[PDB]
Symmetry: C3
């Protein structure tokens, strides 16, 4: 089982991505309880990065299954596929 | 052997967590020598994130042993168990 | 195959490091196309962190081959070795 972690803001918000048995899922903290997020994509390995534009968070999740990495994007309104390609 | 890296400030401070044979340990840089930090917990996989409240650092380490992730918290005065749970 | 991701600035810039078959490479984004960066070092495991000095980026990549981690540094003038040692 393999994790990636990100955080942002003053609360802060935390997102932990877990790769287990070719599935990546998301646990979320926003200052109250941990909860399961919307992110569900295939992968045996994950890494993640985020930034703020004002108060709006932007997340990029790099999901790898075998020899292929797909980027998944949060920009305020659902997970969308990004334009990232490997070597 | 697997690592996680975080940094903060402009010095910078860096922490590198290393999972080796089910033990996670911490190496630290604050502007002079690398040194062994107080973090010592079980795990074969590690991720970490951090934030600053003014000058005070807050670190969260996600230590995974098998199919269980535990969150470890630095808030200025020792490593404490965090409230994180998985799915 | 294993990745590490970092980002900085408002654009933002992103760097994704991929460990594949004991080789770590780098895919870069700066606001248009994804492109291949200069990073090329050995490892089966990678972590990375970055910070700004003003708006100029400093990157540290932790490349692990078997039992030992080597730090690689970007400070604006090519990839250089760092002084990191383990336990
Ligand atoms: C930054 C984001 O924080 C959380 O925000 C939302 C927002 C809408 C939904 C609606 C839905 O899926 N129905 C879910 C989530 S959970 C979680 C996001 O995954 C992501 O981390
Ligand atoms: C920071 C970047 O955000 C996104 O930006 C674009 C822009 C144009 C197209 C076409 C696609 C994307 S997807 C995604 C980029 O890969 C990268 O994450
Ligand atoms: C952000 C932190 O930086 C470093 O700072 C300290 C501070 C005090 C101690 C003594 C102590 O509390 N011992 C506990 C028994 C140890 C460290 S090492 C390292 C921390 O692990 C952590 O990374
Ligand atoms: C940012 C957060 O810091 C910590 O906050 C609390 C707050 C209340 C309880 C009870 C526990 C924790 S532990 C830890 C949270 O999991 C999370 O890291
Ligand atoms: C932050 C960086 O972004 C990218 O920027 C450059 C800049 C220069 C070069 C050429 C070179 O090596 N000359 C520099 C010094 C030679 O003494 C390549 C890259 S690619 C990629 C870097 O790897 C790294 O991510
Ligand atoms: C943030 C840091 O950036 C770099 O900083 C320095 C500074 C001084 C030296 C030479 C020295 O005086 N002692 C190092 C010999 C210890 O055995 C080397 C480095 S490399 C790299 C650091 O590791 C770390 O990333």
């Amino acid at each position: 089982m393999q994790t990636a972690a990100i955080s942002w803001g003053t609360t802060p918000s935390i997102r932990v991505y877990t790769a287990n048995g070719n599935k990546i899922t998301e646990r979320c903290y926003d200052g109250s309880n941990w909860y399961t997020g919307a992110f569900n994509q295939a992968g045996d390995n994950v890494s993640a990065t985020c930034w703020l534009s004002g108060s709006a968070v932007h997340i990029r999740v790099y999901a790898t299954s075998g020899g292929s990495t797909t980027e998944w994007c949060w920009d305020g309104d659902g997970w969308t596929r990004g334009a990232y390609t490997g070597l």
